[PDB]
Design a protein around this ligand. Structure first.
Ligand code: SM2
Ligand code: K
Length: 358
């Protein structure tokens, strides 16, 4: 690999692993459209299994970027419209607070304060309907952004309804397969367990537990190679042969709302480049605080901007992931770890690396 990439990655990540006590980590840097991989430590401490380029990590909320692109692909296929009322897909949502809430609001966390998490007690389809029917919005739709699994999660579930496929089948056939993400999974098959890293929380080995809308909001597991290919695909959508998928990727990076320096896409979040780490942290869900922020609609949405820092953070109880890329520089990075460490530290490292290589 080019020495400049080798050096900045090792000089940045080694200290990070030491400071955060991360058991295992994989990093990919995409430079001028080529991936370079790095691994450290352990996927399974007790069984002494090292992290490799084939190790599966829980992506946590980075899964939302796949959900956003799958929704974009459905829009491109003419199956759904973001301007469609949620009730068009779920007529059973008869409670009056749902009047005026569209798929756009669900996809962008602007429905009026849907909760951060779906309660553990909510499991079945009937439980889910009851939960959304009982939810009382704090605000009118399209006025404030409140990051939430229950918002983009519902968007993903509804977006695939016209297809006639389960969410998992739609993701596999319309996104994973076309992009050759052959070691990316919503449910890890038994044959792949030998490569599934354990997450570590308070020193205990853990894997994510089943939950309602998990697949849609935080349930994808993937390798550093497939994630590098996902970044490549999002950096250069015009190279994608499947027209609706190319279009869907472009729709997911469009700018729908602005709050401060941040713009909300479908799954992806974007800031204009150049920008410093402090601004990225404060202009993203990478902050320690859970924040309600008024938003300004971008009418109509701005098509994907090349000079942007496009990114997404993700976590599960035992994992911490981060993806960021800058289209106009053909540069990107994926950082996958089996410990859920502070988001600001992820942004700091990613920025240090990409700024050095830009
Ligand atoms: B996402 O923003 O990473 C999302 N992840 C999950 O809901 C999956 C998890 C299961 C247990 C812990 S995270 C998310 C993460 C968190 C958090 O800080 O743990 C909160 C809200 C959403
Ligand atoms: K589920």
């Amino acid at each position: 690999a080019p020495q400049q990439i080798n050096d900045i990655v090792h000089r940045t990540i080694t200290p990070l692993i030491e400071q955060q006590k991360i058991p295992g980590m994989a990093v990919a840097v995409i430079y001028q459209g080529k991936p370079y991989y790095f691994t450290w430590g352990y996927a399974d401490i007790a069984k002494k299994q090292p992290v490799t380029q084939q190790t599966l990590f829980e992506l946590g909320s980075v899964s939302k970027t796949f959900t956003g692109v799958l929704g974009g692909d459905a829009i491109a296929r003419g199956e759904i419209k973001l301007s469609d009322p949620t009730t068009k897909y779920w007529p059973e949502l008869t409670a009056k607070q749902w009047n005026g809430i569209t798929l756009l609001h669900l996809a962008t966390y602007t429905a009026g304060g849907l909760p951060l998490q779906v309660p553990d007690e909510v499991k079945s389809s009937s439980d889910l309907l009851r939960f959304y029917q009982n939810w009382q919005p704090a605000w009118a739709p399209g006025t404030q952004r409140l990051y939430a699994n229950s918002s983009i999660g519902l968007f993903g579930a509804l977006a695939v309804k016209p297809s006639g496929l389960s969410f998992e089948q739609a993701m596999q056939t319309r996104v994973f397969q076309p992009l050759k993400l052959n070691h990316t999974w919503i449910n890890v098959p038994p044959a792949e367990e030998k490569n599934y890293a354990w997450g570590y929380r308070e020193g205990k080995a853990v894997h994510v537990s089943p939950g309602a809308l998990d697949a849609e909001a935080y349930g994808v597991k993937s390798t550093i190679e497939d994630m590098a290919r996902w970044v490549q695909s999002n950096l250069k959508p015009l190279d994608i042969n499947e027209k609706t998928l190319q279009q869907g990727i472009q729709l997911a990076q469009s700018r729908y709302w602005q709050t401060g320096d941040m713009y909300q896409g479908l799954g992806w979040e974007m800031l204009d480049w150049p920008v410093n780490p402090d601004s990225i942290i404060n202009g993203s869900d990478a902050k320690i605080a859970l924040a309600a922020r008024p938003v300004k609609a971008i009418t109509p949405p701005t098509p994907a901007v090349r000079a942007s820092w496009v990114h997404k953070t993700g976590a599960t109880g035992g994992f911490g992931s981060y993806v960021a890329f800058i289209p106009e520089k053909e540069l990107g990075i994926v950082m996958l770890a089996n410990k859920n460490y502070p988001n600001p530290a992820r942004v700091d490292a990613a920025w240090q690396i990409l700024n050095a290589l830009q």
